[PDB]
Amino acid sequence: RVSSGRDLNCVPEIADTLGAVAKQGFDFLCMPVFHPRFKREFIQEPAKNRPGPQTRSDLLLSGRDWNTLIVGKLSPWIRPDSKVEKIRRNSEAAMLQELNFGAYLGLPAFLLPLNQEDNTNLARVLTNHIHTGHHSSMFWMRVPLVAPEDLRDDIIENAPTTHTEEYSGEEKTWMWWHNFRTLCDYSKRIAVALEIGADLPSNHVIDRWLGEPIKAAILPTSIFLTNKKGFPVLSKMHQRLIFRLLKLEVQFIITGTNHHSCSYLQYLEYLSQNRPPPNAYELFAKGYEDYLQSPLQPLMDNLESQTYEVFEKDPIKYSQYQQAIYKCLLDRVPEEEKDTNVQVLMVLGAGRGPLVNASLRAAKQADRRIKLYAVEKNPNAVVTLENWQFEEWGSQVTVVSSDMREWVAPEKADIIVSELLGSFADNELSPECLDGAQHFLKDDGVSIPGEYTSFLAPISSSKLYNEVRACREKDRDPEAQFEMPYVVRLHNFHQLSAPQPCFTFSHPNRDPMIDNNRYCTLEFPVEVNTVLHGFAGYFETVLYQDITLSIRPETHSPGMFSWFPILFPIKQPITVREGQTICVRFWRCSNSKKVWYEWAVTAPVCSAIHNPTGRSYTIGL
Amino acid sequence: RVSSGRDLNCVPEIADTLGAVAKQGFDFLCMPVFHPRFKREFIQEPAKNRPGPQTRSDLLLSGRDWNTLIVGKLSPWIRPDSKVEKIRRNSEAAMLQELNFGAYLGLPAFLLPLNQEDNTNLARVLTNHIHTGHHSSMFWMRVPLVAPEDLRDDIIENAPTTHTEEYSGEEKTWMWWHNFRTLCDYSKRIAVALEIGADLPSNHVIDRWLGEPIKAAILPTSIFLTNKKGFPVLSKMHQRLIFRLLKLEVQFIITGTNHHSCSYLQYLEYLSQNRPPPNAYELFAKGYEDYLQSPLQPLMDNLESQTYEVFEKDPIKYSQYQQAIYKCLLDRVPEEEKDTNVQVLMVLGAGRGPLVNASLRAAKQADRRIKLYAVEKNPNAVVTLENWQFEEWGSQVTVVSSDMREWVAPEKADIIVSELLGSFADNELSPECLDGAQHFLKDDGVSIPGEYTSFLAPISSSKLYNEVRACREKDRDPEAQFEMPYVVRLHNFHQLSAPQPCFTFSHPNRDPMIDNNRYCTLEFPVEVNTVLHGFAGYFETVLYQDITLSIRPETHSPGMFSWFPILFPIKQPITVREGQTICVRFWRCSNSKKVWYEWAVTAPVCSAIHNPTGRSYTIGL
Amino acid sequence: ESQTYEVFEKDPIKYSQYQQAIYKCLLDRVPEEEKDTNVQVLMVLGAGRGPLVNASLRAAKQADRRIKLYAVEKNPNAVVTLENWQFEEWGSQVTVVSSDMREWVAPEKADIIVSELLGSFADNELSPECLDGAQHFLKDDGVSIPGEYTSFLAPISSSKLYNEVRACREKDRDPEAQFEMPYVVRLHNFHQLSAPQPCFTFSHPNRDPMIDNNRYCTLEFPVEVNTVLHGFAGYFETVLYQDITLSIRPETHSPGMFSWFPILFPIKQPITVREGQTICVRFWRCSNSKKVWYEWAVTAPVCSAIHNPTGRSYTIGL
Amino acid sequence: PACMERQLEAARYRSDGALLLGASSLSGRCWAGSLWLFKDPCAAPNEGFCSAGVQTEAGVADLTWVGERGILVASDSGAVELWELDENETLIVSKFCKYEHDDIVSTVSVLSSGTQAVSGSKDICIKVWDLAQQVVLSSYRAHAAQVTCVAASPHKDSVFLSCSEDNRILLWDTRCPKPASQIGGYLPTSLAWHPQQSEVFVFGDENGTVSLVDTKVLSSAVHSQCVTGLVFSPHSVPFLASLSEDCSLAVLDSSLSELFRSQAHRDFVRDATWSPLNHSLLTTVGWDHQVVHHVVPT
Numbered sequence A, B: 001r002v003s004s005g006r007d008l009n010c011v012p013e014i015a016d017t018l019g020a021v022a023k024q025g026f027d028f029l030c031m032p033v034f035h036p037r038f039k040r041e042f043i044q045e046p047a048k049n050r051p052g053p054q055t056r057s058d059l060l061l062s063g064r065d066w067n068t069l070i071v072g073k074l075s076p077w078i079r080p081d082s083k084v085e086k087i088r089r090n091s092e093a094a095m096l097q098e099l100n101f102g103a104y105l106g107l108p109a110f111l112l113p114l115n116q117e118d119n120t121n122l123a124r125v126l127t128n129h130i131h132t133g134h135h136s137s138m139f140w141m142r143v144p145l146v147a148p149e150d151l152r153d154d155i156i157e158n159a160p161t162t163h164t165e166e167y168s169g170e171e172k173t174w175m176w177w178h179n180f181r182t183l184c185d186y187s188k189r190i191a192v193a194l195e196i197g198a199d200l201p202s203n204h205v206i207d208r209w210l211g212e213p214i215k216a217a218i219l220p221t222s223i224f225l226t227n228k229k230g231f232p233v234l235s236k237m238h239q240r241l242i243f244r245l246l247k248l249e250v251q252f253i254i255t256g257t258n259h260h261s262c263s264y265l266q267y268l269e270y271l272s273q274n275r276p277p278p279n280a281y282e283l284f285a286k287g288y289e290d291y292l293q294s295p296l297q298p299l300m301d302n303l304e305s306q307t308y309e310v311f312e313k314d315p316i317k318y319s320q321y322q323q324a325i326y327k328c329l330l331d332r333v334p335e336e337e338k339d340t341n342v343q344v345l346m347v348l349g350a351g352r353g354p355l356v357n358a359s360l361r362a363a364k365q366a367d368r369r370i371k372l373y374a375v376e377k378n379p380n381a382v383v384t385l386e387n388w389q390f391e392e393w394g395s396q397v398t399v400v401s402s403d404m405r406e407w408v409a410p411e412k413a414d415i416i417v418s419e420l421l422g423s424f425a426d427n428e429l430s431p432e433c434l435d436g437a438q439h440f441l442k443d444d445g446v447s448i449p450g451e452y453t454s455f456l457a458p459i460s461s462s463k464l465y466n467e468v469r470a471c472r473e474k475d476r477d478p479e480a481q482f483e484m485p486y487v488v489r490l491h492n493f494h495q496l497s498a499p500q501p502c503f504t505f506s507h508p509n510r511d512p513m514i515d516n517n518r519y520c521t522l523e524f525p526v527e528v529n530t531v532l533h534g535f536a537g538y539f540e541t542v543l544y545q546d547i548t549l550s551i552r553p554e555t556h557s558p559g560m561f562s563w564f565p566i567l568f569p570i571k572q573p574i575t576v577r578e579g580q581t582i583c584v585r586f587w588r589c590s591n592s593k594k595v596w597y598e599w600a601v602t603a604p605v606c607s608a609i610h611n612p613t614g615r616s617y618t619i620g621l
Numbered sequence C: 001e002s003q004t005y006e007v008f009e010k011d012p013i014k015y016s017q018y019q020q021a022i023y024k025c026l027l028d029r030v031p032e033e034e035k036d037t038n039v040q041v042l043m044v045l046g047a048g049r050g051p052l053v054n055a056s057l058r059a060a061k062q063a064d065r066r067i068k069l070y071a072v073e074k075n076p077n078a079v080v081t082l083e084n085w086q087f088e089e090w091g092s093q094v095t096v097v098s099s100d101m102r103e104w105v106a107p108e109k110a111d112i113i114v115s116e117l118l119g120s121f122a123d124n125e126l127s128p129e130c131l132d133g134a135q136h137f138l139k140d141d142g143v144s145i146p147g148e149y150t151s152f153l154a155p156i157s158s159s160k161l162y163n164e165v166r167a168c169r170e171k172d173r174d175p176e177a178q179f180e181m182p183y184v185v186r187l188h189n190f191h192q193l194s195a196p197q198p199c200f201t202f203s204h205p206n207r208d209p210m211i212d213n214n215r216y217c218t219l220e221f222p223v224e225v226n227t228v229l230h231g232f233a234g235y236f237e238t239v240l241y242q243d244i245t246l247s248i249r250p251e252t253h254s255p256g257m258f259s260w261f262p263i264l265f266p267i268k269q270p271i272t273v274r275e276g277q278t279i280c281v282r283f284w285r286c287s288n289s290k291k292v293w294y295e296w297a298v299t300a301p302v303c304s305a306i307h308n309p310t311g312r313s314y315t316i317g318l
Numbered sequence D: 001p002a003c004m005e006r007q008l009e010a011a012r013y014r015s016d017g018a019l020l021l022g023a024s025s026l027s028g029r030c031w032a033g034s035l036w037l038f039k040d041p042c043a044a045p046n047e048g049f050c051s052a053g054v055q056t057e058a059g060v061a062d063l064t065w066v067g068e069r070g071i072l073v074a075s076d077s078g079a080v081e082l083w084e085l086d087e088n089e090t091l092i093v094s095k096f097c098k099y100e101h102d103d104i105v106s107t108v109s110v111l112s113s114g115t116q117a118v119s120g121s122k123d124i125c126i127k128v129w130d131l132a133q134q135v136v137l138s139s140y141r142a143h144a145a146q147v148t149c150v151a152a153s154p155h156k157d158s159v160f161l162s163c164s165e166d167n168r169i170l171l172w173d174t175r176c177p178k179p180a181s182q183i184g185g186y187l188p189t190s191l192a193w194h195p196q197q198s199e200v201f202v203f204g205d206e207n208g209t210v211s212l213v214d215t216k217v218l219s220s221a222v223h224s225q226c227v228t229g230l231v232f233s234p235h236s237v238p239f240l241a242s243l244s245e246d247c248s249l250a251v252l253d254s255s256l257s258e259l260f261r262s263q264a265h266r267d268f269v270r271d272a273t274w275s276p277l278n279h280s281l282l283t284t285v286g287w288d289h290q291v292v293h294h295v296v297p298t
């Protein structure tokens, strides 16, 4: 249930050690590819001419074992950032040697340490190896939660441990990593191996690692408190951290000697089994974590059958649609008018008939008379509709194969029902679709939904920022991938400020010269130090009175699978200090053919205006 | 063992038909997505306003069944190339409707017919659908081996079947397909569903389909000759064709009614089991068919351990290397000098020691004294070498970690042995490597190999031409993918002329001012009508006297896995008529840093010079 | 090209400075008592269309000592101009050699090797490699002119130049490559945010045990103003002989010297710098047997990406 | 054991004149160590010409004598080992192997009493051991980086020096409640107490400089590479022998001036030991499997 590995600096017999490690219960071994104490010379004689083999042989293990069980380790004497010139030059050649020796064996990952503020030459040498040869290896940077200088025992008479509280100073190891990956151009091959210490730092320091590519978690044996029966366990503060890392599916690493004279691995498995069972949304979205998809345009495109099927497999949203119609029937037709009044219900954008069926179920429980119309422009869905109307519905449902904005209806409607909302509410163009169907609504008719509002919250996710970069394509703008929204189940991320409302649409629209174009400015108070990469978009909708749907995390309709958050990215990440406000601007723009969004950050610093005039992204009308 | 499907034009109950077809033994069903006789109107009233459902519902089958078992069929009345304007306009809207209905269901493939010379508008309408929406569907064009006009019974008094032999005229159906895919820009989504007829055409007509993307083979029941026990079988000429299609792994389709009143499917399975067992090369290369790989550059790059391992798992090449050394020891050291003479054997480019071991095995069987040197520049392989020298070899093998062109050897050598050859012989730069090691060879020393020659043969493969197009990358020349060789196990292809020798290298080189640059002109007599896409490159080498290695298909060393042919492509395909000669020119060019090839076709028409000055491809010195 | 050699020859200041450096080296090597007994072996490595050879001649007439010249040149087109000069005027004194100075197997060792192999960032035309390859044929007491050169760097703000580097995007390459390569430019609409500091230094001849031409330098630039950093102006200084020097460092510029303009090392993203902050840059001189390149990253007030890693955007051919 | 691995780490002469040898294989299939005794010092390193021999599970990073019988070993396994010579001095038997360091034990030093010791490790910790009870009395994480060297005081059992890659040299004294004290450039690599002045010590850095330090300073550029060790002669007015990664040995006087200079070694010079019998004799082992004997010009 947990992918785990053992970290060692002593492997006398590579095959014996691996056998013992696997028998212990591990899945991989972190061992040095050269003897850790074997300092080598590459410049001056006669140590440079050192004869004999330089390390053990590749033949000692099969290609599968080298590719699946061995995570290499950089030799501890390799100091590319030394103040001594000879040590730097020596360590440069020495570093390339071990990386190229690990590439030679096809090792799945290779560990390099970050234990000081200046790792410029370390980064240079790594960047240069990444651009040399036919690679694939992952590079895990071993970086501690707390610097070893900030966790030393206060036992130096003339150098006491500074007892002052430094909020930003406590987060020095994150800047070690931040600066290192900036130098290396956010290479998708450089990930974090976060070293957990004896006493956990302040929660802000821990929160600094949210949205970072943590691939491994290093738990040293010395952090395990021994229990009553003499077995290793962890504090409830440490346990909570383990539970946060289990969501990111990191590989647990156990380093150091046995101090409970395995049990550490068994304790991790016990913890893994004692986590809450995943809810419906959680079990559905598994697989889609941080996977960027294109937002659907059901107006411009005809949705596939298998797509309509998944939108129909959302019971919560259809039970909420039914009860909204149920309440509107009662509030419109009093019990004395029970059979004298027939309500004209038009399902605009009917799909393969799930709203039409909900409209029917809502008439049986509200016991009122309804006359249905199922308008739909996708002719393929219309086939499913016309076969439903023949086999079950009959004269009650009048199938209309047209665009709701073109349709010349026979009579006006009492209730127009629709499911035209995207993850950013108005992104599938409901404001234009229901505006075009407003003339055939009674001067007292009800639209379901009657209101919808989009939300935005600033986020940090170098994992998602890196994923948006990967979306560069040929024959287009090299930066277009940053000027378009993405539907994504955000997961390895940090939300830097609570969602605020963005754009609001109401139906029907009685405003004199309404206009669907928008411009909104939002100010986000940021309580932490961070790097802004994008803006999560969410939505809320009022179907009827207290019957609502929501994808805003704090008011999420439980068990509602039908939507994932949208992601509005920015070309360049923006450093934000604690206390600073992130000021974003969003526009909803349009012409007779297209609808698009534009957005710019104006604080703490300006960004470029993203998607000016829909050059990267438009929604088709 | 054989992927097969049933073709029908009568599916009264879609679920019943599928059940019967699967119970019969099929894997998929080709059925019409609309009723074949249901002509529809899209322009004039009142047939355009035809009410009711336009076809059966998508709900009748699960998404998996629609995606894995249903190959759609275009309705037989759809004639986009009609001479009648109204029928063309009607059939245009009608064609898009059925393609978009099949895209809606996510069908794995959709059949469209080619049964006339002019399918321009058919192609236009298909090309326009391919650029409309979010696709993935395969389009199989049903095209007959023999046109139905050329297989009619000679029963028309005033229109007799022309009894004259027309070589090119018998290949009219290939030009129907050729012109159709040229119009559609060689879309990787358009493949051939080749219809096999009652009497097979001439073999040249059949050969015209080599190198074409045949995804399905349509065997109609009427082509099955009934045997003694009353079961359907095929002629030995038809059986041979089935065996050629089984190499291309096509999906067999059985169309038409049961005339042996399944058995047809069982006969195909019997044929599949009665094919020759695949040899070592055949079973090894399976998976690599027409997969383009980059040619290795062991000089410029350090080969990975798992790569050296596969080059060591070739017994034939090492037994041939051993016997070449075995014969050279005897021909140099007479039995009277048995222990008085020690031969200086230098394995230049030793790798992980397979040639050094072969050199040892060759001294035990030739019973002569040898002093070995294992030169190697890749320091990672040198680790494996130095661990071999410690654990087994000893003082006999002197490991040298250097480039053979830099090395200042202690004494001259009697025999230099090397394995520096690529699929085009000199493409890993052996001519430069052994030239740099020539000064330290005795004025009577033997190089193994002593000679190597590259070969070239012109080829047709729209499958491989399409695969080279797919290799376009951003940040480079949009056409660079055509100016570089590829190592590939050529499979779905046609070789238009027998291999001719290209470049020849000899070792040692006693020519006054030798020069490794080359220029060769080859004339290829072409006996068939065809489309040239590239030139297969092969090689032959003389290790010692009659001990040779070869990848030339007609002289191939059996069981030799170590190399696959190279592919030298051309930007634009070239039509070649029967009787025409394909004249190619090849250059081997160089400077102090790089070595490259250039090539141009000069007949029947000129091509552009490919890779001028190594702008797309160089080999690093 | 010929018209290019012509403009490099139309710089009187640099040739009068080259002459006086040879003038002083002749006197400091051949005492008046050895006036006609001593002939100095002067080799003009990288002779071009003969302006240094003529300066070497002018320096022997005014220093009144005996010289034996060698005009080494690899460009065969310039060699045509050289061989026509040797025929029409020079004669037996000048021995034209059509070869690469790193290949040439000289007849005898030289007393003085003279060269003009410097770029705007001093070592950017690869003088360290060229004179290293010609070092074996130098006398164990020979003088190289120039004997030393040092590159300089100063951080700059110029949205005009930053915009000009963006405009250099080209198809079929990295969309950002235009920011990972130096440019020779007469900087004008700009602001220099800190005074030039020395970067890389080369000496000739090179007696260091296992010398190595690869470099790594870290410079800290104190910034007294609020600004936006777009690049680093590169400049150079060279010691031909003793107090005879050439310079393109603005504060020590050799007057009337047209032969060079500053180099510009840009950065992909501009960097905000507040008053009081230090701009910390790192520069590397990297190489292999075929190419030489530079890499550079800003590490304060914020990090930048490493520019030109492994010469992916820009290399200098060896 | 049938062989001793080419990487000779430690050379320690006891009171009578026998030679202790620690060695490890820092390359090849097996990465293990070995302890050897040479009653005939001129025989070394001949595996057949030895008096006693043993093989440890993991490499020998450092060792020291525990009187004339026992040997304290700092292993790559993270354990501290104790091996005592038998009644005949022909067998080497293990007494304790305690794995207390979470990483390679790099340095070891026996405290004045002879019943206590200090281990310095790459795991950043320092541990004070009771050899008799076979347990650790105290654990000190005072350093920030790997511990390079620990040097127990010649005469004070609670005093000992330490130095680490964190650029710190710490003066210890268990009697204080904050026992470390920072004394003070380039990283400290080697620590040697003066055998006549319990207030003076020498330290060698990674830049080859050796320096003279009085607790309440003088410097010289001895080597071109990291100073691996510093060992004082048994003389009443000692000589200082400085080992190095530049494969050379130097013997310096009181003012750090060079007297001897030996290039005999072809690989890293690891340990040095002056003869108890001949004070002009210094023995130096190295990674080139040599056991070179030196005649210091006195």
Ligand SMILES: Nc1ncnc2c1ncn2[C@@H]1O[C@H](CO)[C@@H](O)[C@H]1O
Binding pocket: A298, A299, A302, A303, A348, A349, A350, A351, A352, A375, A376, A377, A378, A381, A402, A403, A404, A405, A419, A420, A421, A428, A433
């Ligand atoms: N303007 C429109 N007219 C009619 N149906 C529409 C319109 N826009 C979207 N739909 C349909 O509404 C459903 C919900 O997106 C889909 O089936 C879509 O095809």
Ligand SMILES: Nc1ncnc2c1ncn2[C@@H]1O[C@H](CO)[C@@H](O)[C@H]1O
Binding pocket: B298, B299, B302, B303, B348, B349, B350, B351, B352, B375, B376, B377, B378, B381, B402, B403, B404, B405, B419, B420, B421, B428, B433
């Ligand atoms: N010039 C060279 N010098 C030494 N070994 C070489 C040279 N070129 C190729 N090799 C080695 O020869 C083997 C066969 O390609 C490989 O192990 C390769 O690394």
Ligand SMILES: Nc1ncnc2c1ncn2[C@@H]1O[C@H](CO)[C@@H](O)[C@H]1O
Binding pocket: C045, C046, C047, C048, C049, C072, C073, C074, C075, C078, C099, C100, C101, C102, C116, C117, C118, C125, C130
């Ligand atoms: N390595 C070289 N060998 C000879 N001449 C050179 C070399 N490099 C540059 N030059 C020449 O030196 C002059 C100054 O750049 C030019 O004429 C150039 O062509």
